[PDB]
Amino acid sequence: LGKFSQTCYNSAIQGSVLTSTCERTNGGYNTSSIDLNSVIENVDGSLKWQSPNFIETCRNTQLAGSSELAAECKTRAQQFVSTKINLDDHIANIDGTLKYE
Amino acid sequence: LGKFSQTCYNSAIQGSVLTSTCERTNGGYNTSSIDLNSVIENVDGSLKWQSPNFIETCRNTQLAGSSELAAECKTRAQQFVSTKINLDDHIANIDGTLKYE
Ligand SMILES: [Ca+2]
Ligand SMILES: [Ca+2]
Ligand SMILES: [Ca+2]
Ligand SMILES: [Ca+2]
């Protein structure tokens, strides 16, 4: 995965955004940008790649009660345990549409 | 923040997606969906809200060498330490455009 640096040049980082000029398969180059803010997290001082989608390591997702998401999720030890989270924490109803905030 | 459940009904969760029918400010209801996969993470078995954008708790971001993102990031103890991450880990050059994978 990755390896962009091997076929790109003039890379730069401003804030959360990486910009670089990269080689196209069909000759020629293209300059593009990517915002790393959401795919990179700060964990107790060290930059780590954002954790994988939870559906990759959790099963049997259900709505518990009126606003809780419940599931059986894998521990680092590879064992499934019960867990839940209140979606009312961050999911809002903004004029009829569900929005994260 | 949040509190969608107080003005919505017929909520349901399928996989990573929450769907609910919510009250509009201007009378009437609207049914909408939101995918929780990326805003909820599995940390050692418990569902936690995905960590905040790293630019919120990190400063002085720079490109170190050809592919590393370097910065000074806040620890849980509120002290800034040096950290870096190799963007070649997950940032690819897909036919001239930077893409995460
Ligand atoms: Ca509900
Ligand atoms: Ca549970
Ligand atoms: Ca580079
Ligand atoms: Ca550093």
Curated annotation (Swiss-Prot), chains A, B:
Transmembrane regions listed in the UniProt entry: none
SMART domains: CVNH (SM01111)
InterPro entries: Cyanovirin-N, Cyanovirin-N_sf
Disulfide bond in keyword set: yes
Biotechnological applications: Overexpression of this protein to provide quantities adequate for medical use as a topical microbiocide has been attempted in a number of systems including E.coli, Lactobacillus jensenii, the yeast Pichia pastoris and Nicotiana tabacum; see PubMed:20162270 for a review.
GO MF: carbohydrate binding
GO BP terms in the entry: regulation of defense response to virus
Annotated S-S bridges: 8-22, 58-73
Keywords assigned: Antiviral protein, Disulfide bond, Lectin
Post-translational modification comment from the UniProt entry: Cleavage, or reduction and alkylation of the disulfide bonds results in the loss of anti-HIV activity.
Documented effect of changing residue 30 to A/Q/V: Prevents N-glycosylation upon overexpression in yeast without changing anti-HIV activity
Function comment: Mannose-binding lectin.
UniProt subunit comment: In solution exists as a metastable domain-swapped homodimer which very slowly converts into a more stable monomeric form at room temperature. Under physiological conditions it is unlikely that the dimeric species exists and indeed the monomer is more active against HIV. Interacts with HIV-1 gp120.
Family named by the database record: Belongs to the cyanovirin-N family.
PANTHER family: CYANOVIRIN-N DOMAIN-CONTAINING PROTEIN (PTHR42076:SF1), CYANOVIRIN-N HOMOLOG (PTHR42076)
Additional detail: Its activity in situ is unknown, however it acts as a viral entry inhibitor, inhibiting HIV-1, HIV-2 and simian immunodeficiency virus (and some other viruses such as feline immunodeficiency virus, measles virus and human herpesvirus) infection and replication. It prevents essential interactions between the envelope glycoprotein and target cell receptors by binding to carbohydrates on viral protein gp120 and possibly by other mechanisms as well. Addition to cells must occur before or shortly after virus addition. Is remarkably stabile; the protein can withstand multiple freeze-thaw cycles, dissolution in organic solvents, treatment with salt, detergent, H(2)O(2) and boiling without significant loss of anti-HIV activity.
Name by which UniProt lists this protein: Cyanovirin-N
